[model samples]
Target: NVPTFQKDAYVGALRENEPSVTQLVRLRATDEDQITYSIVSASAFGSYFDISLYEGYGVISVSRPLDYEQISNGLIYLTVMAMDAGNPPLNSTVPVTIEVFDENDNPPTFSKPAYFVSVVENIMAGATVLFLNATDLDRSREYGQESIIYSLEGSTQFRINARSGEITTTSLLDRETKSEYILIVRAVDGGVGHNQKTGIATVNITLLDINDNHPTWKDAPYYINLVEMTPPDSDVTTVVAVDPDLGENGTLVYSIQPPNKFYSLNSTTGKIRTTHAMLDRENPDPHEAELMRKIVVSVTDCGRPPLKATSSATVFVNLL
Candidate 1:
């Protein structure tokens, strides 16, 4: 006949990483005998907590750190027993509930360190490039999962969804201007209180080339004046043009439309020259006798499906 339970139940609050050996609760009993205390229920979590008894007083303390993400329930239903050694050994049991508070001890982590994607140029705005995923080991609240916000650094060509981490283009992308883009994405936990954490990941995007522009002539309506009896293979002039693409898409070839008797174009160098000594200023053909003839010089790029541009040039044959 010994100890008798004075309180049947106890409730207390605890925070994670609270200074070690923090007292959680104390149990009281009516007895003059020395009592030994032990947890009978929820003993699996006993390693995180400690219990001690002195006479009729039983004290409970947190022995280790608490994590709300690891244990979301926050409720630990513990049955504590008080035992006395006097005569036939009497014992009393008390129910204890320990509630662990949430803390911003967890930082957001991305699924991958770097994300790679490819997007074709000239795609419509608001097109999503890819999705980014991250995890936070904190409880949901103003600063937990619900408070996570995504942001992009040093780039205005794209935007991101604050809650979902979906990245989308903000405007048209031109591969000629830039072939690749590197973005630094950040995930920040905005939950209330201190110890908020942030995570970073890289977004690499390669812009695929497209035939969006035509070859442009540098000098249109160029004129080449020469005597009617000029020697064959004489240089007339150089026709130059440029394309706003790369690699094969920008490689250009020069040509003249419908062929020409007085002038020939260099397919590789765009240089126009006389192919033969056939120029006659007083020929019977009215077109050849005019002393002036016009030809359409074209520059075509080797893009997929190809694109072309044309300009007119004049060739004047004067009498020697």
Candidate 2:
């Protein structure tokens, strides 16, 4: 009589990369005498399986290496043939399905070793700085592609997507407060427990200038004392204005409102000096015995559609 398998199709599972000679499935067929086992076909991958006829049963085990990446479907298909060693050798075939379990063999990696990106200052909150992605070599049946989670470290003003690896601003950006940032981003594979793997990448962010700041007069109220009939072109004092913005956005042009014949201001340097030597402090028009002259100084930044700030100082001219 011909050999008959107990089941028409058999199914089993084993971890990938298991050592050679690891038993995958044990099958026994009903026959009158001794049986000889052999693998018939496996879609040109027959060498991966080794079949042996043991006492009263046939065992299917591993013959060579196994890689989950090679087997994209994560299933190995094979047909084991069991034959009785009779005079004519009666044979029978049965389908064998072995599911390969994925192991966390490879860690996730980013597209670039380090990221250098630029963003404009004053960008709105939740604005995307950049989109980043990583790769993981492990895949499983239940976990699709094994999600790579992304997280950021060393930045309180920025946040990264846990699933998408998108970096976003957590708050409104200001270049004056902080112009650049170096952050550490980590990507962890979805594998749990001892199988988890991690990767790291450096993200360098540069905040471009927006020219959002206006010039601020550093000296609110200045004081200067000059002698009557001071020499013409004499340097009395120098005023200062400060802007926090970068480059031309912070450049200041100084001016004095209500031009005075006795005093003048330098547009570039904010220097106040005597225009002529015929200065006299005897006449009091602003209602003061000290002959105090109030000088209104205004400063404007070089930014497009520039902004201005004004402050006044007292210049007291005493009689000589």
Candidate 3:
């Protein structure tokens, strides 16, 4: 039986103007079972060089140096050869193809460095930010599938439409916390892989404020008046008030300024009931009896940031 062999090697990673170089030879078995291999140069310029050994084989690679700049387009190739190790070996060779792909070595850059766009607080989910596009001078395996590398972190609050390149917000916006948001986006033409070339694009999302709440009075008002000589322990009048807001802020509480000996205000019920005993409205010296007195009452509510309100009215005291 005759022995067979094969081989493959790198040819300087391929380039233009440099023809791949390799050699092949074969040997035929002598009647005595010994093999004799020989070198054979084919083609006028020997474009395909062949060197003979004690067997048949072929070696091929780039014949000359390749300048990447000079090569409009270049790539690496994988070539293999089949040889029969007979006394007079038979040789055959075939071409194997390999391609060179583009890298994200050159980060994409924006023509304007940055840009701005204004969107209302309640923008549609698919609203576009001026149709963004990224460009990079790169070679790719396929013809049109380039420019897929994207970095979305620069603007976490927004998203980029993979097919349309539209940047849109992911959730509701707050004008109180942030009046405006500065967004920077990056895009690249990564071929075959996640080759991202970061570039800068800006978006200014302006938030609009709305009047969602109404101004409310914390509580109602109360008034009081008693005799001119009312005793310190005499209840001259009563005061009360109420609130308009809902919840704790809506819960009415009554209070009085310069607290009166005639009456005290209630908190929970907005009541201004008398805190002391009442006095007679009519009497001799007037100082001897309860006289006419007056007092003011205010209302407030319980809230983290509480609210309050006040009102006044006149009270009369006839002879008890």
**TM-score of every candidate relative to the true structure:** 0.86, 0.89, 0.37
- For each candidate, what is the lDDT? 0.77, 0.78, 0.46
Candidate 2 worst ten-residue window by lDDT: 284-293
lDDT of 2 by residue, 219-272 (tens): 556766677667888887888888898888989898876556666888999888
- lDDT, candidate 3, 1-320, per-residue tens: 33223323222223223454343222223222233332232212233333344333333333443333222344433333344455456544334432323333455555676666665555555455466666544444222236554455554667877644667677766444556777666665543356444566675566554322233333322233334434544444444444433456456555655455555545565444454445444434444333234445555566556656534433433433
**TM-score-sorted candidate list, best first:** 2, 1, 3
The residue ranges of model 2 lying beyond 4 angstroms of the native Cα positions read: 31-34, 84-90, 141-144, 283-292, 310-320
Which 10-residue window of candidate 1 scores lowest in summed lDDT?
A: 311-320
Write the number of the candidate with greater lDDT, choosing between 1 and 3.
1
Best by lDDT: 2
- All-Cα superposition RMSD per candidate: 3.0, 3.0, 14.7
Ranking by lDDT: 2, 1, 3
lDDT of 3 at 201: 69
